[PDB]
Write a protein that binds this ligand. Structure first.
Ligand SMILES: [Ca+2]
Ligand code: NA
Ligand code: NA
Length: 323
């Protein structure tokens, strides 16, 4: 009974360009600089994105098991769009959480949540799950233990049938410190997760203290963007300067698509990212890729109605080799 969406694409030998895809309909003037995000069908996601994260699986503030249902398209047609990406080797994940996620599981829900993740895979053809909890959801209910527990049941289930169910996370970078609530997600899932993409946007003047240059390097400081990206990566790779350890081969830079997609953290020149990729590779620690919020923003328009014209994927696709 298999079709194109029944496959779970292998990204284990590729760098990724990961884009979030908004499953809801745009509301207009939704941008941080009053632009408008596009209503793009999943199948029309630009080819440079080889991983697409469908946003979001979420709760309802009443019941406990998160769920997802596409808007304005039936299940078989949505699956066919997932199949079309899958056929070209492109993974489609379901993203859990988001702002106003109402994600709040309780001890004993791990099996029912795993079963729900398996029904998503069987119904829509998803290839993995991306943990994208808002700040409040990190330690809400028993999320910290139930979500890892459920995800291990799902990975193991697919591993039995020959498939690699992808597990990713997109934490806000200030939470990736020792003794942090978030640390337990990483250590619980240390042999299960495929990559971690810290969000390097919307955190204002938080950043990293760097002895080498004797400066606080903030995420909203454009003068020092090159240093920010480099030292943030270096800190994760080595578990230094206050940050947890993420292996470079499992590290993705999370960047906003343009100035409408996030309040701060937009990288004004893509050469900056290429210089960092180049430096890291010369040291033998090349990273797994780039992630962006969001495909819909990449295909959206600014407040003056000027299209963004996929300017993010056009610039970074070639840096990670998906274009
Ligand atoms: Ca699939
Ligand atoms: Na790999
Ligand atoms: Na590999």
């Amino acid at each position: 009974a298999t079709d194109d969406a029944s496959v779970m694409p292998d990204i284990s030998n590729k760098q990724v360009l990961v884009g979030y895809w908004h499953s809801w309909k745009s509301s207009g003037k939704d941008g941080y600089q009053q632009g408008t995000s596009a209503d793009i069908a999943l199948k029309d996601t630009p080819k440079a994105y080889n991983v697409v994260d469908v946003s979001f699986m979420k709760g309802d503030g009443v019941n406990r098991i998160p769920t997802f249902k596409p808007v304005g398209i039936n299940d078989s047609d949505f699956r066919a769009q997932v199949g079309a990406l899958n056929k070209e080797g492109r993974a489609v994940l379901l993203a859990l959480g988001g702002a106003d996620g109402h994600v709040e599981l309780k001890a004993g829900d791990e099996e029912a949540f795993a079963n729900e993740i398996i029904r998503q895979v069987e119904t829509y053809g998803f290839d993995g799950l991306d943990i994208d909890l808002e700040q409040s959801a990190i330690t809400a209910g028993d999320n910290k233990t139930v979500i890892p527990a459920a995800l291990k049941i799902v990975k193991d289930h697919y591993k039995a049938e020959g498939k690699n169910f992808l597990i990713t996370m997109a934490p806000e970078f200030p939470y990736l410190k020792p003794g942090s609530a978030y640390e337990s997600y990483l250590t619980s899932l240390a042999n299960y997760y495929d990559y971690i993409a810290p969000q390097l946007y919307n955190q204002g003047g938080d950043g990293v203290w760097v002895d080498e240059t004797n400066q606080w390097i903030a995420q909203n400081n454009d003068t020092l963007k090159e240093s920010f990206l480099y030292y943030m990566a270096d800190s994760f790779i080595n578990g230094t300067r206050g940050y947890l350890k993420i292996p470079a081969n499992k590290f993705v830079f999370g960047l906003p698509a343009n100035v409408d997609a996030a309040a701060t953290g937009y990288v004004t020149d893509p050469q900056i990212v290429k210089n960092v990729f180049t430096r890291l590779q010369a040291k033998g620690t090349p990273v797994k890729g780039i992630m962006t919020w969001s495909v819909n923003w990449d295909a959206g328009k600014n407040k003056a109605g000027v299209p963004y014209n996929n300017s993010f994927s056009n610039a970074y696709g070639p840096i990670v080799g998906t274009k």
